[PDB]
Design a protein around this ligand. Structure first.
Ligand SMILES: [Mg+2]
Ligand SMILES: [Zn+2]
Ligand SMILES: [Zn+2]
Ligand SMILES: [Zn+2]
Ligand SMILES: [Zn+2]
Ligand SMILES: [Zn+2]
Ligand SMILES: [Zn+2]
Ligand SMILES: [Zn+2]
Ligand SMILES: [Zn+2]
Lengths: 185, 192
């Protein structure tokens, strides 16, 4: 509701000038990114969970990975990105902010990166956007890489096997178009 | 979407359901069901070991948190003698006495007692109950860095939002829940 959203949106502080330009670039180049309010909510949920390690599927231009790394200065992010041009942009944006060492960008097809990643230590958080497709495939491949007690955040989940998945305690939260928060048993 | 979220509620133990109807029929402060379910999920996500609550009422929130977090301990403070006695019986009913410690007293008079306890991961207070700000100031130093202060009934706030030692956001669930995350000479002047 506009009243409530006006109230909640006035609470959003300014980002780094470089980050605000990234937001403009994404709009200009029709690259979806999370809305400012949804993003502040997600970053707050992550701060509450206090993760050391985050795996994100679908880097795009690196906006979400950079926002997370900046909000969680002691976390490390691994982010997977298909395409070279978005991947290339993302790499430069990460480097621009000196975040190479805390954001590992993997290029490219998450489907043939799972063999690499299974030698990594378990992740505290997995972030997947159901809207980028192959949702069931990435959940299956990467959920085993999340620690017990850990979180899978599924953006756009409703846009049932998840909700009824025996190993996960799942609830949908009103962030953006609905985000599933699944806590691993 | 918002209609789907409206219905997102699993059945509670019959005894808990009876406590809910009782709170309603007897007009005892109780967290609304959708806010409660969201709060419990956020707590599970944060995995706190030690929770302090100011305002036990009849023990509904203490009980539901203890049930959601089987490893955690809860300390809860209530000033109304009738409510405290009822809460104590409900806690006993459910076999939860070893994990829920109920204190009868005025929280604003119990600071020195509570200082003795180990730091809490979560402080739960109610923006709709009296003395909210005094409770915040008094008990926030008893929360660990990185810990949470959760405030119920925040929408249905400037001082809270700009209080320096906390990173606070308001979540639009139930009646509004604020989640505040705790941040980490004289003659001497001669000679130096
Ligand atoms: Mg309420
Ligand atoms: Zn750029
Ligand atoms: Zn390939
Ligand atoms: Zn929408
Ligand atoms: Zn009524
Ligand atoms: Zn839950
Ligand atoms: Zn009763
Ligand atoms: Zn204060
Ligand atoms: Zn209400």
């Amino acid at each position: 509701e506009e009243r409530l959203k006006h109230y909640l949106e006035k609470q959003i502080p300014a980002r780094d000038q470089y980050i605000e330009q990234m937001e403009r670039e994404a709009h200009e180049q029709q690259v979806p990114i999370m809305d400012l309010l949804g993003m502040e909510s997600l970053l707050h949920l992550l701060k509450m969970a206090a993760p050391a390690r985050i795996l994100e599927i679908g880097t795009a231009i690196g906006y979400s990975a950079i926002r997370m790394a900046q909000a969680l200065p002691e976390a490390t992010i691994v982010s997977i990105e298909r395409d070279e041009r978005r991947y290339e942009e993302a790499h430069k944006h990460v480097k621009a902010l000196g975040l190479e060492s805390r954001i590992e960008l993997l290029f490219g097809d998450a489907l043939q990166l799972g063999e690499k990643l299974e030698l990594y230590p378990l992740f505290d958080v997995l972030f997947i956007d159901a809207a980028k497709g192959q949702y069931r495939r990435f959940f299956d491949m990467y959920s085993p890489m999340v620690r017990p007690g850990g979180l899978i955040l599924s953006d756009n989940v409703l846009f049932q096997w998840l909700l009824e998945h025996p190993q996960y305690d799942t609830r949908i939260f009103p962030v953006g178009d609905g985000i599933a928060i699944s806590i691993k048993r």
